[PDB]
Amino acid sequence: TGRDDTKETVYISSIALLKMLKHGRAGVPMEVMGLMLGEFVDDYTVNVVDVFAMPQSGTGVSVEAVDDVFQAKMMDMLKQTGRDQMVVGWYHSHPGFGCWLSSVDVNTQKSFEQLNSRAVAVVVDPIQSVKGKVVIDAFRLIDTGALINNLEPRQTTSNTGLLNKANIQALIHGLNRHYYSLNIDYHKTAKET
Amino acid sequence: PLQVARCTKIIKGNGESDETTTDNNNSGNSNSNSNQQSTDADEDDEDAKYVIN
Amino acid sequence: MSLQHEKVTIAPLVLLSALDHYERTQTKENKRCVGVILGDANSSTIRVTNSFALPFEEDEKNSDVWFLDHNYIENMNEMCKKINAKEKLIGWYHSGPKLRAS
Amino acid sequence: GDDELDQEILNLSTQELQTRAKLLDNEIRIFRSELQRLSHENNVMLEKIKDNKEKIKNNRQLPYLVANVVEVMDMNEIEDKENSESTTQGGNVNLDNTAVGKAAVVKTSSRQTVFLPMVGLVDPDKLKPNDLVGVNKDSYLILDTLPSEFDSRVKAMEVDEKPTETYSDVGGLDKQIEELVEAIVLPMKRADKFKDMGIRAPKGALMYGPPGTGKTLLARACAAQTNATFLKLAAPQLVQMYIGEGAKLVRDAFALAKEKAPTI
Amino acid sequence: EQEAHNKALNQFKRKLLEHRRYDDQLKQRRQNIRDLEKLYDKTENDIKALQSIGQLIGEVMKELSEEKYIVKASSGPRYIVGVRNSVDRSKLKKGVRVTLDITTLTIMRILPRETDPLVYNMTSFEQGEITFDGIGGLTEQIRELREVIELPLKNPEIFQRVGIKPPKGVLLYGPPGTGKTLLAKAVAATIGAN
Ligand SMILES: Nc1ncnc2c1ncn2[C@@H]1O[C@H](COP(=O)(O)OP(=O)(O)OP(=O)(O)O)[C@@H](O)[C@H]1O
Ligand SMILES: Nc1ncnc2c1ncn2[C@@H]1O[C@H](COP(=O)(O)OP(=O)(O)OP(=O)(O)O)[C@@H](O)[C@H]1O
Ligand SMILES: [Mg+2]
Fold first, then answer.
1. In terms of CA atoms, which chain B residue is nearest residue E45?
2. I need a labelling partner for D15 at 20 to 30 A (CA). Which of A63, A177, D212, E22 fits?
3. Residue E182's Cα: distance from chain center in Å?
4. Which residue's CA is minimally distant from atom 26 of ligand 1?
5. By the 8 A CB rule, do C48 and C92 touch?
């Protein structure tokens, strides 16, 4: 191997949580989307600094809705202001479903794995959250070849992990297939607070 | 379990332009759904469709 | 132009970004972050939807010497309109830490 | 009508024909380069319409839901970029409220109504109110048009050739055969001669008399002779205990007779 | 002649027969790239249509709030639904017909008022033409029919003079074959209302 492999604890800063929700709530009932800026340190610690949205050229969550020029142009802008950092995932919204990726959105996540090795797909529920707290879960997709020959348990150990059963059975099948899910935590500055 | 239903009309699924890729009113061949505008020469639909109620 | 604006209500997100932007550009006193302010106006209720950073350099030897990235602004204005059309240029923030005559 | 041969030397100076001949060395380069473009483009454009046909064949699989078309909206897909509908109104940006074009509201046989923007495979020059359409069950899209069909009981009434009696087994009663063929058989065959006379053909004949005189015989004969669609009907079959489904039987049987025309 | 330019013109005339060959192919391929792009408009629309969904039609039964509306759907059950934010809140009120996503049950967009498909079939019927010179014997009855049917359409100012209501509701009755169906068929092509 190259690493022992375990799924990321996402320390989503205040500005990024709040921003994904603004954009995705406005976008009800369409699929909404955009890219995540952050930095990857440790064996599982992804800090997501900001998000920025990807202008809809499709229906949302398509590869017709991800434009090469747009991607290029946004990056080129972020350098002037120092916000340029590497892409640590992408967000999207289902406002008709819980946190559970649909078949089309797996296909979008399969393309992101080529781009980035540790890219997450984060499902933001804008209205459908079932607790007082916002329900968001992050997923990563790794191949079926590791998971089937029984390397999935090893990957999920030495961490507290997260189990959800929001769509019950449907979730479990999906969860299994993709990879895993891990506790999501929030980074607060005392200026921000 | 097999639900009991009923035939209302036998529809022909080959040679009737069931595929409308060259039909627009009556511009369809109605002799092929096997090489009408197909990448294959062989069958792409069935011999018989039927209308169940 | 209109002077009919009796209140400004600002979203938590606008405040949080502009403030957040100050340390993302890693500026310290006597260097300025400014950004574009997007939102609704022409009304009494101003509703401040979003903001994005600009680069801003302040020289205070002469208050007639200033840096502003012109092209950046026009480009960015057009992209934001395709997510949501209610975003217009309604102003710019100055990062303080006080008012000036400048 | 030919040029550049020994005949043009007689007609015209030899100086003109040098400039005509040096030109055709240059002119053929236009034909040669531009032919490469079309033959190479015509292999790529021929690939485009087959590459989509391959996906058309994944959708076309059975079974699929049945619908009829409540109303074709027929909004204008392009007519401005200030709208995107048939309607034109002041102000640009009406967001995704303007996004209705050639559109079908279909009502399914689950007895619900959906709107969708149709598949242009099925043209809206087909669709009228009340046409049978297929609709894919998974996502309601008009998959195809189904030919309009009618109740299975009606379908049973159509002829399968009723035994020929000719007019050697309608023995006697000549005058009745004569009176009957004038009202039923001539307006089919000789339909042209009444149009000329400016009179209208009958709408029917009635046969009445005492039982056993072969009124039923003469019809059975008539079936064999005209070789058109003969819709057999028995009047107590038509009456039906479900409210006005007896009436549905009238209209369908006669609707059927429009199609299979000429009819008896 | 006895020229060598008599020979040159034979040699370039082999290019002029070759201009004719080129023309057959060039024009034939030009028109065929124009045919494969007509087909290309129907076979791309399947793909784009396949990226569309059906939307359960309902109607705003009655406003609760600005975020939450009550929509009763055309399948039975009443729902309490959300909004798209393009949908104008002053255009959403009781009677109006709306469409709803099958995934989210969200008010997608407004539609014009809708009617049963049986009643569209009733207005289709009316073909050909009959005038009141194809009716005879009934010139008295033609006038009392027009007294009720033509006049308040043209001018209800006549009925207003007297201070009396306009009539509506005509019953025609007769022994069969008196032309009672005929009388109405003729007046349907004349009056020029629906
Ligand atoms: N003129 C005739 N020539 C030949 N056969 C006849 C003649 N009249 C009647 N028949 C025979 O008598 C049989 C029985 O009569 P059929 O039932 O056809 O009579 P109908 O008067 O139409 O009766 P109903 O009104 O009672 O149904 C016929 O099927 C036929 O074989
Ligand atoms: N008043 C009339 N003047 C001229 N032609 C007439 C008149 N009445 C009937 N006819 C002719 O006879 C035809 C048949 O009559 P039609 O079927 O319209 O009658 P009806 O009295 O409406 O019938 P039903 O009782 O079956 O409802 C007409 O189409 C027309 O050619
Ligand atoms: Mg009548």
1. B21
2. E22
3. 29
4. D211
5. no
